[PDB]
């Protein structure tokens, strides 16, 4: 046993991590950086041990030698006696979401429209839709496809950041952390909800979790699921209840990564921390809930039931799967 130093991305995660640190009696402590890429460099330097990453960022971390440790597991759809920690993960569905009232927008008419992305380099927000678009258009000029976008982590003066809003004060426009109003799954879906954009690239669960009273958050509390449609790759639009037949890809769940030399320790500490603070952990809700943050998905997604053990001690390529890896590789050829 040593202490595990977690890396928080931006100040809202830093505050949650400090609460966790306090509750864990400094079994976990906190390092903080402004972007996920900077947290990954902190882990490579050995100045932090671990953080939880979207698959696109697991690709970056894994090219640098970091390894997957445990994966987010949300509620299974299909029955299982299996304990959450031992259950195989079922990826999530990457979708393209639009307003029902924006009639006649389909997959085939996205050129020159306004788009909302979780962040450059993330799976559902970026790698899957821009990979598909580069391929279908035969051009690497994916920075000129949409007329304007919010794609946190792109050049703040470029059209890919034209729609980003920055923080409370309008500072930090387009930074890829939760201070940007339109960052991440919930930020990109808010960008669509507010009709800042015409299309949001998020995951199926985002739409459900921020509609029909599922969020009380001020911009979401009044949104109705029937006012949204999914874009299918065949050019059709479906209701958001049809994501199993109308998605862009199945994504590998977000997962914790660490240096190889610290993975075993990180895994043990985390399994013990979720026993205390995870979904009905000994001390959640009374002292601290590791997987809650009032819908902001800070450190972990709010829909996480547990962090689950991986089968086969996978390398990052085995975890992401060979198809997704080659999709990312192909897209990164553009820049």
């Amino acid at each position: 046993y040593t202490r595990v130093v977690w890396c928080a991305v931006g100040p809202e995660e830093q505050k949650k991590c400090q609460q966790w640190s306090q509750q864990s009696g400094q079994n976990v402590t906190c390092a903080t950086a402004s972007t996920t890429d900077d947290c990954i460099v902190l882990v490579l330097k050995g100045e932090a041990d671990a953080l939880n990453l979207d698959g696109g960022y697991i690709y970056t971390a894994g090219k640098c030698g970091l390894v997957p440790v445990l994966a987010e597991n949300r509620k299974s759809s299909k029955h299982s006696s299996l304990d959450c920690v031992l259950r195989p993960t079922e990826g999530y569905l990457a979708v393209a979401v639009v307003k029902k009232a924006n009639e006649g927008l389909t997959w085939n008419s996205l050129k020159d429209k306004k788009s909302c992305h979780t962040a450059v380099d993330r799976t559902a927000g970026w790698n899957i839709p821009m990979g598909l678009i580069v391929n279908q258009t035969g051009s690497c000029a994916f920075d000129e496809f949409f007329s304007q976008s919010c794609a946190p982590g792109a050049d703040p003066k470029s059209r890919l950041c034209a729609l980003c809003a920055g923080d409370d004060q309008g500072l930090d426009k387009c930074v890829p952390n939760s201070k940007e109003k339109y960052y991440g799954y919930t930020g990109a879906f808010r960008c669509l909800a507010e009709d800042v954009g015409d299309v949001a690239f998020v995951k199926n669960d985002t739409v459900w979790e921020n509609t029909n009273g599922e969020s009380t958050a001020d911009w979401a509390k009044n949104l109705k699921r029937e006012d949204f449609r999914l874009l299918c790759l065949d050019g059709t639009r479906k209701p958001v209840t049809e994501a199993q037949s109308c998605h862009l890809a199945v994504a590998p769940n977000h997962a914790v990564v660490s240096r190889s030399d610290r993975a075993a320790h990180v895994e043990q500490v985390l399994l013990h921390q979720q026993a205390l603070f995870g979904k009905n952990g000994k001390n959640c809700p009374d002292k601290f809930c590791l997987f809650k943050s009032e819908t902001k998905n800070l450190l972990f997604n709010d829909n996480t039931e547990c962090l689950a053990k991986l089968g086969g001690r996978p390398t990052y390529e085995e975890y992401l799967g060979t198809e997704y890896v080659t999709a990312i590789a192909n897209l990164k050829k553009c820049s």
């Binding site: 990954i40 460099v41 490579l44 970056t60 090219k63 590789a329 990164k332």
Partner: peptide
């Protein structure tokens, strides 16, 4: 394909 980005 190649080296670490950093």
């Amino acid at each position: 394909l190649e080296a670490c980005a950093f």
